């Protein structure tokens, strides 16, 4: 499936650009010829690595949900310590 492959490529593109995610993953877009959407939820990361999405405080990672028709792909992109 072309759509699944494109969703993975785009997701990898986001994973390389965590500081760009608020702009690059911000509503509707086309992938593999179909309309879909990207949503990025800011998450906290505990000292033990536990994830809180959405965050009540610091944004240390994003929960990214890419949706194209019924297909869906969710991952976590961690932000650099800086």
Author numbering: 44 to 125
Please, what does the article write about this entry?
Type IV pili (T4P)1 are long, surface-exposed filaments which extend from the surfaces of bacterial cells. Three of the remaining six, TTHA1218, TTHA1219 and TTHA1222, yielded crystals of truncated forms which enabled us to solve their structures (designated here as Tt121836-123, Tt121933-236 and Tt122238-123).
Although the structure of Tt121836-123 identifies it as recognizably part of the pilin family, it exhibits a different fold topology from Tt122238-123. The first β-strand is formed from the loop between the α-helix and what would be β1 in Tt122238-123. This location is similar to the conserved disulphide observed in TTHA1221 and Tt122238-123, hinting that this may be a common structural feature of Thermus pilins. The structure also contains a second disulphide bond, which links β2 and β3 in the equivalent location to the D loop. Both Tt121836-123 and Tt122238-123 form 4-stranded β-sheets, but the location of the strands is displaced between the two: a short α-helix and β1 in Tt121836-123 are formed in place of the loop between the α-helix and β1 in Tt122238-123; β2 in Tt121836-123 aligns with β1 in Tt122238-123, and there is no equivalent of β4 from Tt122238-123 in Tt121836-123. Our results show that TTHA1218 and TTHA1219 are closer in structure to T2SS pseudopilins than to other type IV pilins for which structures are currently available. In P. aeruginosa, the type IV core minor pilins, FimU, PilV, PilW and PilX, are clustered in an operon; determination of the crystal structure of FimU revealed close similarity to the T2SS pseudopilin GspH, despite the low sequence homology between the two proteins. This work complements our observations reported here, in that we have identified two type IV pilins from Thermus which are most closely related at a structural level to two other T2SS pseudopilins, GspI and GspJ. Inspection of the structure suggested that its formation is plausible but would require two structural changes to alleviate minor steric clashes.
